[PDB]
């Protein structure tokens, strides 16, 4: 069976700008799928859906 994913937490609010970005709120948990070519955008999952968020608006959490 596949292991539970490790998670991240949102550091700051980010309002989606369209274009497959995802709004996130400080304190939400996220699962990270990956990053774009320069690492500046992060494709993540939250309770609100899936999409791109700024990579430095999130961080690992135990």
């Amino acid at each position: 069976m596949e292991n539970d994913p490790n998670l991240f937490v949102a550091l700051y609010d980010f309002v989606a700008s369209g274009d497959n970005t995802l709004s996130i709120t400080k304190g939400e948990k996220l699962r990270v799928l990956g990053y774009n070519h320069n690492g500046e955008w992060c494709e993540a999952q939250t309770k609100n859906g899936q999409g791109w968020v700024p990579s430095n608006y999130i961080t690992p959490v135990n």
């Binding site: 980010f14 497959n20 990053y35 955008w41 791109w52 968020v53 608006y57």
Partner: peptide
């Protein structure tokens, strides 16, 4: 992912 850069940390 967007072709424009994300906003800087606030």
């Amino acid at each position: 992912a967007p072709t424009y850069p994300p906003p800087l940390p606030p």
